[PDB]
Amino acid sequence: HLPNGAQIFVETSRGVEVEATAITNAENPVATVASKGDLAKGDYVIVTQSTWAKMVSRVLIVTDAQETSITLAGIDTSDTLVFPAGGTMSFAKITGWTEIPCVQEIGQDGGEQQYYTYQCLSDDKEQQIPTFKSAVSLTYTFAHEFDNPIYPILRKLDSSGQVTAVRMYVPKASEMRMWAGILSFNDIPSTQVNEMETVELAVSLKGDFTFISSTLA
Amino acid sequence: HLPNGAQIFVETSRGVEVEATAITNAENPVATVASKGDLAKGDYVIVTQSTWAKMVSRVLIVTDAQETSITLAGIDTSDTLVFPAGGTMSFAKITGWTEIPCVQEIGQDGGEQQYYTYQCLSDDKEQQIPTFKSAVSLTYTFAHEFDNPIYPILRKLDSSGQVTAVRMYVPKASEMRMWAGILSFNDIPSTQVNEMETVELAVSLKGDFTFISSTLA
Amino acid sequence: HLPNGAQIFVETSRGVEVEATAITNAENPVATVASKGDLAKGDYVIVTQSTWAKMVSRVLIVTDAQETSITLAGIDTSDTLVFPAGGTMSFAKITGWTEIPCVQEIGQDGGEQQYYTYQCLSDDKEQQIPTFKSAVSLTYTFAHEFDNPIYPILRKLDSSGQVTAVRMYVPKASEMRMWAGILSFNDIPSTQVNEMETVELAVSLKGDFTFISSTLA
Amino acid sequence: HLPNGAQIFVETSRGVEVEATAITNAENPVATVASKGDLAKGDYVIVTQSTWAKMVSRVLIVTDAQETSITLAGIDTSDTLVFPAGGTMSFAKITGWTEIPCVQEIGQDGGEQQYYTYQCLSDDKEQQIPTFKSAVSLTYTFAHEFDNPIYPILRKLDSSGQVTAVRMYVPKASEMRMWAGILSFNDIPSTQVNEMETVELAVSLKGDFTFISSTLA
Amino acid sequence: HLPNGAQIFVETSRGVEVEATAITNAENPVATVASKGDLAKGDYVIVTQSTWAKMVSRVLIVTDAQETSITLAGIDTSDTLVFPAGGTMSFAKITGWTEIPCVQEIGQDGGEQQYYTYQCLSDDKEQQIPTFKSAVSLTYTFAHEFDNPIYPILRKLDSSGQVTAVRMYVPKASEMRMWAGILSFNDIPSTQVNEMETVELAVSLKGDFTFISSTLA
Amino acid sequence: HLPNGAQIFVETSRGVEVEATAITNAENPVATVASKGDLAKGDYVIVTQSTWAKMVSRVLIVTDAQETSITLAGIDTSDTLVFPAGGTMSFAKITGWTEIPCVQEIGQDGGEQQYYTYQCLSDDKEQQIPTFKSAVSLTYTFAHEFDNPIYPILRKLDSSGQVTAVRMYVPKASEMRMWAGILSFNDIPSTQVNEMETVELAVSLKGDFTFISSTLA
């Protein structure tokens, strides 16, 4: 298993909102949407709002294109009791994607669980209570091509903060990952003699990673 | 003595609670439990609560499967007076284990004894007294395989804080080490060209290490 | 694409102010200036003041030399609604340029977006909102020649703070980069045996980079 | 002079207290103890309490075994007037020793004299006066063997703080160095592939080093 | 252009003060001094006081030895309006120079322009205004020779703070640089086996560097 | 000029105090002492107290052994007016010296001039006033030999603070340096396999370095 050959894409445009009245809570979630509009098999959907704590901004996939009962399989399993019975959801389908020219470095900063420390007289050692998990950000570095159409799109997405979707596909394991976040795009290119010029892009997560097989497509 | 060939497992499920009315204090502790349930020889049991200060969250082994008096031999010796006469214990038996795919790096952070400093007009040099010992955290790095069934188990154990049990068996010296702690599992895999993808797991100890021979099994 | 052969020029002199009454907001902006004075095709014009938030100190190039309607093509697109209908802009024409003798190192310091953090009782995790982007400073290092006419010009520009214009041309991609900022010029030369002497220059950015093709000229 | 071949031993057990009424203050101190008990020549005695400021916890060796006058030769010389005329001392006889399996690294941290700084109006430069000397801690790293009997002894010594005695013998110079301190014993073994496992021990110094020749024995 | 062969001298003695009643402000300044005393061509003079803000402690060269109107050509040009009309100046002529034996390393610390930051409610980004420029310090390291007559001179100049003059002449480009500052001279020589002993000298600038051609002499 | 072959000695003992009523202030100082006692040619003297600001604890050499007029030539020249007319001095002669076994590393820490920074409303740049020079300390590292007689002497000098004298002689340049300070002597030897054991000593200056030729002796 090697990461060679993987390529990363970003969202271009999204359609109008679609409302899901009811969601089943087991294995692959099922969304009961009346008169679905252009939701075939294999499309990608971004959840924009919900009342189920998780799954707020996580990208999912539609496997069944039924008229009234859309089954957004994806990865998330709602069988756990953490998600209560009553649940609402709103999602938008993605239209197209654009590929980053030449990624040469991927690095991630963040994570780690924060704790609250206390000690009473009875206690012999200091005790801790978990409080929350810090944020995670990634930086991508790619080559400089001022004619590349990705530059206006990145500039526009940076101008107005919006939770876009990012996809990257690894061919060796036929595995597909998806996440959503805000994009802040630097554009001043660092130049060094006898070395290619590079530009750097940063993403701040708003959800969790999704792992699927490429067979679903 | 070389550490090559050692493999690490984690707890998968545990049985119902078992109560021990009385414990002897010498060499191998003996638990007087009426009508023991499926406590065969070689089993692995975790202590969940007790009033003997130590042994709160330490994993032990039963050697005798007597009807009313099981002998929790383990490693710990309670002969010292530190453990008082009257003592109660509750322990749960472990059912199955799951092995981490490919551990490539093991690191530990923590330890060290904290002191409190003071000085009087009579004293010529600053004096110190011990107060308590800091915590210990362990990190493991293993390869990325999104189909591996260990991922749902680790995600579930990370979701709800629970003091699970971890075991590592070294064949060269025929040692088996057991400890208990909380698991926090990251899942974002770092990628670098011409290098495998890695994921990292973290453990925070809640007890002390146990050293046994593999002959007991 | 290689950066070899690129050369950097600075400002020498600028003409009197020219006022634009009305500005078209789409693709290439058009400035309606009555009786334009010496605004031939290919000239470089720096914006000194405006009421459109952006374009405050960004360098542009004219393509049409019409008597009453000069088209400041540049790169900036005013089609976005961010720029309101009513708008004014004043620009100065650049006369000549002077080349830095021998640039040996280019480095950039700055960037990054600052955030404001808050957390409510209802929120489960800490939330962030962007506030503003930090400044960017560029440094250039070139060889020491005390007879070079660029030295008095740079010293004069450093003495009285003025937002001058800088151009650097990359021949491999036929791309021209322009930006404006303040110049602070150090002149003490560092000397080391068996090594040439160097003098360092610094620029404080005041605008945004403009990327154009060299065919416009 | 090379340190190869040196081996380190620790305390195992000590006898009952023995009281000294009068102490001679010159060269080798002489202790006047009525009816000494099993104080044969070459024995190791650790001082537990005294009123002579120094010699509080410094290890010494007897050379003479007279019925009422034992000579604690050691290295310490009491000829200096710092020790007053009237003096008392109590010491304990050491029974046996235990050798650390395989020391691979010895490191020290501490020392240095702290100062107090002041400056008057009349003074032209800042002046300093010494206050006291900081503490010293030693660390040892040795291989991991869970059957080694030294492990229970070290764990017991760590459990209850006691000022034990440590000896290390260098054969090349035939020199014996002794000191006393508290032992805090870590036991989590660090593991790395293609490398032996190690455990680390720490000692907090409580006295002063004694240098003697091995001919005394 | 290579710095090899350059040698550095320091001031040894200076003459009595000379007062300049009037100074012209263009290109080479001209000082109208009645009955000039021994001001031959090619001489070196340091300015000790003036009311023209700059030129306070900058070393210059006289090119004309006229009876009443000496022309202090130097490097500085007073044509700028920054220097007002009415101006007074006092300068002292230098007599002799002494050369540092063997300079092996030259390093400079200081520079950089300090800013003051503020932000208003109306402003969208933080704004800055310059306040002042920091100082510059130079260090020289040369070989140890206790018989060298330069040592008493440096010790004397260090004892009483005085703004001496320093000159360095580079033969490859025929440049001669002059600056003034205070000298603080360390004398403890660092010793290392199989390496020469070195001593270090430090200079704190009080003015600006002067760049001239060696043809003036 | 190489430092190879240099050896360092420390003071062993000193004689009774000798009082100087009058001192001449020019080149080599001359001390008017009635009925000098055993002050031949070539001896070393330590000034213990004086009212001449400098020369408080600086080692000097006696060249003339006259009955009433001792000429402490040394290095210091009192011709400067800084030393006033009236002056008293007390010095003690040194008896013997002891050599450090094997110095392998010499390092110095300290120096640098401290400044006081202020700025007025009228000033354009921040100004500084020198206040005082920091202290200087040196560390010596030598091999471990527990039989070496220098160890009791160093321990005794460390026990009671005293401004002893240290001398080190460089044979290549026939130069002799002398300084005075307090000695703090560590004795715990660091040991490493296949490496010799070392001990470290530290000195804190109370005076200035003296440079002479070895011909004086």
Residue numbers in the entry:
A (entry chain H), B (entry chain L), C (entry chain G), D (entry chain K), E (entry chain I), F (entry chain J): 2 to 218
Paper text:
Siphophage T1 is representative of the T series of model Escherichia coli phages, which has been observed to infect not only sensitive strains of E. coli but also some strains of Shigella dysenteriae. Siphophages possess a long, flexible, and non-contractile tail that plays a crucial role in host recognition, cell envelope penetration, and DNA injection. Connected to the head through a connector complex, the tail of a siphophage consists of three main components: a tail tube, a tape measure protein (TMP), and a distal tip. Using cryo-EM, we resolved the three-dimensional (3D) structures of the icosahedral head, head–tail complex and the tail tip of a laboratory-adapted fiberless mature T1 at resolutions of 3.5 Å, 3.6 Å, and 4.3 Å, respectively.
